[PDB]
Amino acid sequence: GEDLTPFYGLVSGGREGKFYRELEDYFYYSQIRSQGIDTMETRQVSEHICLSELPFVMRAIGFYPSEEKIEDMFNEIKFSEYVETGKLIDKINLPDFLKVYLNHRPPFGNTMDGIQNSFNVLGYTNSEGKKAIRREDFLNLLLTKGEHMTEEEMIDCFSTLFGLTPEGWKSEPAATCINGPEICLQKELPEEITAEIFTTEILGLTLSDSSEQLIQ
Amino acid sequence: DVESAVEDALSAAGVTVFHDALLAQWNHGQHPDPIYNACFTTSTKPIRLECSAFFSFYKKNVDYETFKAFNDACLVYDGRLVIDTTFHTNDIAIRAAGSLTKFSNRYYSNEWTHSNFSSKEIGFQLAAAMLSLFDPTLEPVTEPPADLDRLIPMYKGAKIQGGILPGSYHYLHISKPAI
Amino acid sequence: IEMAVIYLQKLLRGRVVQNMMFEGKEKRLELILELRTSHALQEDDKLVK
C-alpha cells in the first residue's frame, strides 16, 4: 500500500500498539519541555517538536545515538529541505520523525553484541575468564576516552541510574544528594564490572530476539 | 453614560487619566525600591509621571506560589485549574471550584467557567455534591454518567459587582452569566 | 577502543535520559492525557482526530 502503511507495519502494533501510544506521549511531553513545564498561559502544542528535543525523544523511545549521530540528524533535517526552499527549517512532524527513527534505529531490537564486543576489546578475561574491567579503570576510561565526560557529569549519571537522586531532575532541587554518590562510586559499583553486571544496571528490558521468516 | 459621568467627576477632581498606555519602567534602570518616577508608553508619544506611590489592580491571577504548589502536585493545570463539571480533579479525592478552575477542552467552552457565576451558588452546589459522600441519610450516589461529562449545566445565581465611585457615588451591577 | 567506549557512553547517557523522560511523562501523564483529549499529533490528528 501507500502513505505510512509500510512504516506503520514496521511498528509493532502499528497505529494502536502500546509502544506507538507510548511514543506519541513523548512528543507531547517534549513539547511541554520546549514550552517549559512552568507557564501561567494556556498550554499549546501542535504537530511539531524543536530539534533539540528530538535527541531527547529518540532516547526516550529506546535508541541511543552518539553526539555525532545527533549532529548527523540535525544536518539531515536542516539541509534536506534546504535547496528547494532556500531555508533552514527546524519544526519536524511525527511522520518524518518516525521515518528517521526507523532508518536510524538498529535493524532489530537493541542487541547484546556490541556490548560484548566492547567489553571484549576493553577488558581482561577475569578469574571466570569473563571479559571484565576494574572499577576505577573503567570510570577513568569512560571520562578520558571515547567522547569525554566531566567527572561530575558521570557521577550524576551513576547516581541517577542507581536512583539515589530525586526523580526526573526537572522541577525540584537535589543538591543534598550528590555527596552520597561520591561514596556510592565505591559502594554501588563492584570492583570487577562485566557486561552481565552493566546490562543488569542499564536494562530491565529483556531485549528478546527478533524473527523474520514471514518477511518478504 | 455612567463611565462618562465618572470621567467628568475625575475631571472636576483633576485626576490624571491615561487610556492606551502601558507601564514603562518606574525608576527606568535605577534601583526600584522605592519608586519615585515612572514612564508610560503610548501609541504616539512618551509619558513620564511623578509617583510617590503605586497601586496595582493590573491583573488578577492564581498566586505564583500556589500555582507552583499545584504544579508540584501534578494536578492537571492548563494555566487555570482543570475539573470535570462535577468538581473532580485528576484525583478522585481532590476537588476544586471557583474562578481559579476551568474545564477540559472537550467541553469546548473554555470561555465559560466558574468565574462567570455567583460565588454562593457555586459553593452551595459543591457542598451539596460533597455532602452526598458524607451524609448517610440520603442514599450514597454513583459517580457521574459520562452523559453529564458532555456539558456544563446552566447555573443562574446572578453575579454581583458593586462599588463606590470617584465623587462619592454608589454603584451596583448584576449580571446573568455570559461571555 | 574509542568506539567501544563511545558504545558504553551512549548506553549510559541514553538510559539516564530515557529514565528522565519516562518519569516526567508519568507525572504529566494526566496533563498529557488531557492534552491529547483536546487535540492530537499530526498523523493521528489527521485520521483519528
Resolution expressed in Å: 4.7
Specify whether the CB–CB gap between A157 and A146 falls below 8 A: no
Specify whether the CB–CB gap between B39 and B28 falls below 8 A: yes
Residue B52, min C-alpha distance to chain A (Å): 31
**Of A201, A155, A149, A150, whose CA–CA distance to A174 is shortest?**
A155
For residue A111, what is its C-alpha cell?
542487541
Reported in sequence order, the residue ranges of chain B that DSSP labels E, i.e. its strands, are 22-23, 37-41, 47-50, 81-83, 101-103, 159-165, 169-175
For residue C9, what is its C-alpha cell?
557512553
Running DSSP on this structure, what letter comes out for residue A170?
A: S
Tell me whether residues A40 and B68 touch, CB distance under 8 A: no
C-alpha–C-alpha distance, residues A106 and A98, integer Å: 14
Does residue A39 sit at the B interface (CB-CB below 8 Å)? Answer: yes
How determined?
A: cryo-EM
Q: Give Cα C38 to chain centroid, integer Å.
A: 20
Q: What are the residues whose beta carbons fall under 8 Å from the beta carbon of A42, sequence distance 6 or more? A: B78, B79
User: How many other CB atoms sit within 10 Å of the CB of residue A205?
Assistant: 10
Q: How far is CA A94 from CA A17, A49, A50, C30, C45, in A?
A: 16, 8, 11, 21, 11
Tell me whether residues A171 and B78 touch, CB distance under 8 A: no
**Of B55, B52, B178, B69, whose CA–CA distance to B115 is shortest?**
B178
Instruction: Round to the nearest angstrom and report the end-to-end CA distance of chain B.
Output: 22
C-alpha–C-alpha distance, residues A115 and A194, integer Å: 10
| AA letter at B49 | L
Residue A179, min C-alpha distance to chain B (Å): 25
C-alpha–C-alpha distance, residues C17 and A59, integer Å: 7
Specify whether the CB–CB gap between C25 and C33 falls below 8 A: no
SS3 A92: strand
For residue C21, what is its C-alpha cell?
523522560
Specify whether the CB–CB gap between B159 and B117 falls below 8 A: yes
Residue with cell 523474520: A212
C-alpha–C-alpha distance, residues B124 and B141, integer Å: 18
Tell me whether residues B105 and C39 touch, CB distance under 8 A: yes
C-alpha–C-alpha distance, residues A27 and C41, integer Å: 8
A119-130: b (≥16 Cβ within 10 Å) or e: beebbeeeeeeb
Tell me whether residues B105 and C38 touch, CB distance under 8 A: yes
C-alpha–C-alpha distance, residues A144 and A157, integer Å: 16
**Of B116, B130, B118, B117, whose CA–CA distance to B88 is shortest?**
B130
User: How many other CB atoms sit within 10 Å of the CB of residue B178?
Assistant: 8
C-alpha–C-alpha distance, residues B119 and B159, integer Å: 7
Tell me whether residues B72 and A171 touch, CB distance under 8 A: yes
Closest residue to C32, CB basis, from A28, A141, A167: A28
Helices (H), ranges, chain B: 2-13, 64-73, 120-134, 146-149
